[PDB]
């Protein structure tokens, strides 16, 4: 509630976020813009360059399986970040699981934007860069499955948030009291109110020329709710066709109840 | 510096909101709570008496559930016109590209109807006919085949939304923010719609602080409710689709086309 206490919370969440996530937005921006000789990624834009890149760093399943592996690693990183949110580990254990169950996808998408520009996405911890054209041009259902992630990222990235903002935003998402099945909504909201207070002040101080960025950033939490919906309705269709494909037990369990 | 300008905008939207809308939330609350007693519809027989007393302009299907459905349609058509006239009083709206005016209303009316319908609802039923009637939630929820499940989500939303305890002066600004959404599909000139929405957001923010000083982060919680609004309108149109395909004058068809 007091200003020094809110800045204190912001520093705690940023320092923790740096510790939980291996590749920040600031390092990703440095790789994506370039002018550097040491951080230059190998670019995959077609089938042949994908074969060479595996020596350096079916095709559509192999790329899909690559996304699965990272999303599982991301859920692990998000779970570790979540534990550091003051108050989270003190909630009813069922609500802990329930907040994570519905929060990871909205967060995975948000942080996936940090790795993208309009032309592609960083992979292999930034050693690689796979183009948007190549992904969107994958066959049958997989092409249309990759592109909405880019469509979201382009719009989210125009807000020009940095990592210090995202650490607080990611926390507000996790601590949503409107998830289905929560047992005690009140203590989750009390945490979110503080986190929101912390976000508002962080955004006011860090982005003082950006009018009403707080309101605009909460409205992006709208776009995320719908985009996760589309994602799970498209993934369900894809498993019905690709009898081979299987999902990591961690992702499996999140999607069992959607 | 701009604070008085924002209170002026809040008063401008409040005075207009009273003129545009037949039954305010403050008048509806007095009816539902007790402080001219309305006619109560709880079942089939009392519905026939209510239409035989109150002149339901919409009655020419002999079935009960279709006749209630058709009553909601007729009132929604009136609300679209009420919202359309209120929109003209939002500073800057009439100066927009006529196509953008049409587009903002086309995509906004549903979220607004849902929002203001909450003003007429409590956990036990809904006001109709300018407050002269009161139709119970049990009766509506228990209508047959798809009609029961179509009525109830509106109550489930209203109960949660009304927990914020907004009054008409708050709602006048909130409604305006919705209309002026710069992300509607097909807008030709987004900038001045966002420029107006930024003003409206500032005015809502200060209004909510002055009017609700004990309610922490109510501004945030109110924006988070526009999440609930996009999703429930999505389900709503997918439910109308099932009702048009399973159930059923071309002129009447044409009036209700949207
Ligand atoms: C051989 N190819 C690769 O190694 C590779 C190719 C392209 C992209 C990537 C990185 O992909 C992500 C990274 C991160 C991260 O580094 O934090 C986070 C997310 C993705 C990513 N999830 N996702 C999904 O579909 C997905 C999502 Cl959103 C959420 C939950 C579950 C899944 C999935 F299980 F079903 F995959 C993507 C779709 C398209 C794109 Cl472009 C990226 C992703 C590696
Ligand atoms: C003779 N009157 C009746 O028979 C009757 C029976 C029950 C309720 C009502 C009032 O109904 C509304 C009033 C107002 C208002 O006074 O401001 C505003 C909205 C409704 C109302 N729209 N809606 C819809 O379905 C709907 C919605 Cl949400 C949005 C857009 C379009 C539609 C529709 F076009 F498709 F109808 C309802 C569903 C359930 C309930 Cl309980 C109320 C409503 C009158």
UniProtKB/Swiss-Prot annotation, chain B:
Location(s) in or outside the cell: Nucleus; Cytoplasm
A GO molecular function assigned to this protein is: DNA binding
GO BP terms: namely: BMP signaling pathway; cell differentiation; cell fate commitment; cell maturation; cellular response to hypoxia; cellular response to insulin stimulus; cellular response to low-density lipoprotein particle stimulus; epithelial cell differentiation
* Residue positions of motif 9aaTAD: 250-258
| Record keyword Plastid present | no
**What do the Gene Ontology cellular component annotations say?**
chromatin; cytosol; intracellular membrane-bounded organelle; nucleoplasm; nucleus; receptor complex; RNA polymerase II transcription regulator complex
Residues at which rosiglitazone binds: 73-76, 110, 236, 256
| Predominant subcellular localization, coarse grouping | nucleus
Quaternary organization = Interacts with FOXO1 (acetylated form). Heterodimer with other nuclear receptors, such as RXRA. The heterodimer with the retinoic acid receptor RXRA is called adipocyte-specific transcription factor ARF6. Interacts with NCOA6 coactivator, leading to a strong increase in transcription of target genes. Interacts with coactivator PPARBP, leading to a mild increase in transcription of target genes. Interacts with NOCA7 in a ligand-inducible manner. Interacts with NCOA1 and NCOA2 LXXLL motifs. Interacts with ASXL1, ASXL2, DNTTIP2, FAM120B, MAP2K1/MEK1, NR0B2, PDPK1, PRDM16, PRMT2 and TGFB1I1.
Q: Which disease is it linked to?
A: Defects in PPARG can lead to type 2 insulin-resistant diabetes and hyptertension. PPARG mutations may be associated with colon cancer. Obesity: A condition characterized by an increase of body weight beyond the limitation of skeletal and physical requirements, as the result of excessive accumulation of body fat.
- Report what the protein is called: Peroxisome proliferator-activated receptor gamma
The species this protein was found in:
Homo sapiens
Full-protein residues shown here are 235 to 503 of 505
């Amino acid at each position: 509630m007091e200003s020094a206490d809110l800045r204190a919370l912001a520093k705690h969440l940023y320092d923790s976020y740096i510790k939980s996530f291996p590749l920040t937005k600031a390092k990703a921006r440095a790789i994506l813009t370039g002018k550097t000789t040491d951080k230059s990624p190998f670019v995959i834009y077609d089938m042949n360059s994908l074969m060479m890149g595996e020596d350096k760093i079916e095709v559509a399943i192999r790329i899909f399986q690559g996304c699965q592996f990272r999303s599982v690693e991301a859920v692990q990183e998000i779970t570790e970040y979540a534990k550091s949110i003051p108050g989270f580990v003190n909630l009813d254990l069922n609500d802990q699981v329930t907040l994570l169950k519905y929060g990871v996808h909205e967060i995975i998408y948000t942080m996936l934007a940090s790795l993208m520009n309009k032309d592609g996405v960083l992979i292999s911890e930034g050693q690689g860069f796979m183009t948007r054209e190549f992904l969107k041009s994958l066959r049958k259902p997989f092409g249309d499955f990759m592109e909405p992630k880019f469509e979201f990222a382009v719009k989210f990235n125009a807000l020009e948030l940095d990592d210090s903002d995202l650490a607080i935003f990611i926390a507000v998402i996790i601590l949503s009291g409107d998830r289905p099945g929560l047992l005690n909504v009140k203590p989750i909201e009390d945490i979110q109110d503080n986190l929101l207070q912390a976000l508002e002040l962080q955004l006011k101080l860090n982005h003082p020329e950006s009018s009403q960025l707080f309101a605009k950033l909460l409205q992006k939490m709208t776009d995320l709710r719908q985009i996760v919906t589309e994602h799970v309705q498209l993934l369900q269709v894809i498993k019905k066709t690709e009898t081979d494909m299987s999902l990591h037990p961690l992702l499996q369990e999140i999607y069992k109840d959607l």
